[PDB]
Amino acid sequence: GPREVRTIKVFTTVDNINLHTQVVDMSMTYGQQFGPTYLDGADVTKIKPHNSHEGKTFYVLPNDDTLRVEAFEYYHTTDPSFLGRYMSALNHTKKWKYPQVNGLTSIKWADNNCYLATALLTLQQIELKFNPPALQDAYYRARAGEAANFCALILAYCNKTVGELGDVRETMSYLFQHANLDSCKRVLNVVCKTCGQQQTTLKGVEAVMYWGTLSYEQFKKGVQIPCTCGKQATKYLVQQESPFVMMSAPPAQYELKHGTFTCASEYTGNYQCGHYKHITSKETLYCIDGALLTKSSEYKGPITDVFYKENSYTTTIK
Ligand SMILES: [Zn+2]
């Protein structure tokens, strides 16, 4: 008989839904045949096919027309490096633990993931619909307790790697861009005794996010901002249409009072070397810190984001 190649049968994919049958040469690396290749997040680019690999599914980079279409439609990304960064993160997040704390999926602390835990807890408490099929799929999986893919996707979408220190407000900003916030609208009015008044309408992400004040009530009453003429002007909320709002500000000692907010991010410590915790208002106040939970009737600490429920609001200010 003539000398012949040994092969096995595997599937490749970019979305784990459309599987593509491949015959691989056992004498070559996966990289030699597919380019960068991943097995449940593990980089097997330099590995030759094992007999145990037969029938398994491998993730590859979108390097042909079919895979580019499938990656673009599933992930809503134009970045060729997306699949690689996602799988590199999944290799770690699949090893994290995701305890249920107070009825929510949290993350046990690892790899400086405190900002991810507080973001994950927050996402389970505000009404959000993600546009990428990958995010909406992984999110439901996260609510059921299996958050590893959702966490690796958040890292990919935010261009962060495992172990990098993160920021909740920036994370929320990246994710909100992938959310359907089309019916979200905010109308603001800015009043200066000299220059008069000017109204502004904001839609989408800019209608739900605000930087500089934690108190939604204070935003309704009016916040002092500098105006172009050197006098402090007053900016106040005229109309809001959204299922929630997110008020953020530099970490500052702040009292959280039960029933007046949905949840909040505490940041202790110094700039870019501190620690996030999550505070949620249920029947009392719950402080979720990864796997850890404490309860209290009152809470005061260095708060940096507060989330509030909303539906429709219209000022009574003339
Ligand atoms: Zn002015």
Numbering used by the authors: -2 to 315
The authors write:
Papain-like protease (PLpro) is an attractive drug target for SARS-CoV-2 because it is essential for viral replication, cleaving viral poly-proteins pp1a and pp1ab, and has de-ubiquitylation and de-ISGylation activities, affecting innate immune responses. Based on recent findings and knowledge of SARS-CoV PLpro function, PLpro is an active enzymatic domain of non-structural protein 3 (Nsp3). The PLpro core has a domain architecture that resembles human de-ubiquitinases from the USP family and comprises “thumb”, “palm” and “fingers” domains. The active site residues are found on a flat surface, split among the thumb (Cys111) and palm (His272 and Asp286) domains, while the fingers domain contains a zinc binding site coordinated by Cys189, Cys192, Cys224, and Cys226 that is required for overall structural integrity.
M208W performed similarly to wildtype PLpro against each substrate. M208A appeared similarly stable to wildtype PLpro, while M208W strikingly increases the protein melting temperature by over 5 °C, indicating a substantial improvement in thermal stability. We set up parallel crystallization screens with M208A, M208W and wildtype PLpro, all with intact catalytic sites. M208W readily crystallized (in 14/96 conditions), but we were unable to recover diffraction-grade crystals of M208A or wildtype PLpro. After minimal optimization of screening conditions, we collected a 2.00 Å dataset of M208W with space group and unit cell dimensions (P21212; unit cell 58 Å, 85.5 Å, 83 Å, 90°, 90°, 90°) that were unique compared to other PLpro structures in the PDB. The Trp at position 208 had clear electron density and was accommodated without disturbing neighboring residues. Overlay of the M208W structure with PLpro: Ub, PLpro: ISG15 and PLpro:3k structures indicated that this mutation does not introduce steric clashes with ISG15 or 3k. We examined B-factors to determine the extent to which the M208W mutation stabilized local PLpro structure. In contrast, increased stability in M208W PLpro extended along the whole β-sheet of the fingers domain and propagated into the α-helices of the palm domain that pack against this sheet. The area of stabilization encompassed the 3k binding site and may provide a mechanism for improved 3k sensitivity by reducing flexibility without perturbing structure.
